Amino acid sequence: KDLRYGGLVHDLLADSGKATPNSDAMEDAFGTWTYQELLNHSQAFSAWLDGKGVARGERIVVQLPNIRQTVAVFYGACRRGVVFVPLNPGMKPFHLRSVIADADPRLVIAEDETAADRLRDVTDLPVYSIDSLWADVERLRDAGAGAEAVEVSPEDLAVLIYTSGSTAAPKAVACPHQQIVFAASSINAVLGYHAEDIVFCRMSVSWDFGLYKVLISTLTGAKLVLADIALVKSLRESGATMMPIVPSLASMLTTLIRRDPEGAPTLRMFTNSAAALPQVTIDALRSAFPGAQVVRMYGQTECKRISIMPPHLEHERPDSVGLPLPGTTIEILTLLPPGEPGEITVTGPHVMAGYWRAPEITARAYMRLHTGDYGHLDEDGFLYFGG
């Protein structure tokens, strides 16, 4: 439909960079880039990788906060078939050691010089601070470098997304270009982001929750705001229209909102995943933001996302986490009839390429994804947990 099959991630950026070069693409605490600017910096970063001889298929590990440079790193890497491995700032050292070694990168990008030193303790790979490598990126940007394309297959890996905690063995979902682009397009076919949306994103891009607000905004030409007591004020002052949430962020927001009768009227949608959103939170979100839809979703990183409750149905089937993503199938398993509980299983062009270098773990979970969650489909195709 609007579903994209066989896509490359960086093509999302090239399109918007040509289609709306002068619209705002990314804002952070420090400034704003238009789509032209994001394209230029992404190209410049691609030349920096070329300059360092990082080849197609190799990984870079990037431990950065939510700032404009990280998005340019993501796209520039994509443009060279290099594998973006985003990690959250503040991981414990031993945890980093384990994950960096598993990811097996060509090099590592850190937040600043103190962080670059801590990283040097835990790997022998080359480690670059973002502020120092960025002086070069800007030179390259000024020289117009990296503008050329290179061969990248839709089947090539774009990203490894680590989901394992400290106390666990390292584990990353291995994400090819095509699946990513497909999943973004399918989510958006349900959610309806568009070019005048302003997305207020408080999730790290190291989580697929934030990564996909980068992708979905880029896909549609929207503006992404990379964002504590001031949350209400931030939302209102950014003119935010779309906001991904998790239940703890939504409770916080409803507490904060009662202290501020100016609200954040520009808000039109909250999209919840990751955990079950209680009714009381939903009610309080609608009360503070009567203009906004509160949309329930459910997913796993293994296939990005599984179900979305269509916005227009937000008041119905209160126990459901919605319908399958458009272009995908949910089956309950030996296929069971409707209403019969069983394991939630998922088939489609969003199902990712397994876990990175872990045939054994991959075998149990994976062309069909077994979520290890249990529930049923009602008569109409809607998904529920339990019975």
Ligand SMILES: C[C@H](C(=O)O)[C@H](N)C(=O)O
């Ligand atoms: C964020 C969710 C999760 O795995 O917790 C899922 N990746 C989703 O986007 O719906």
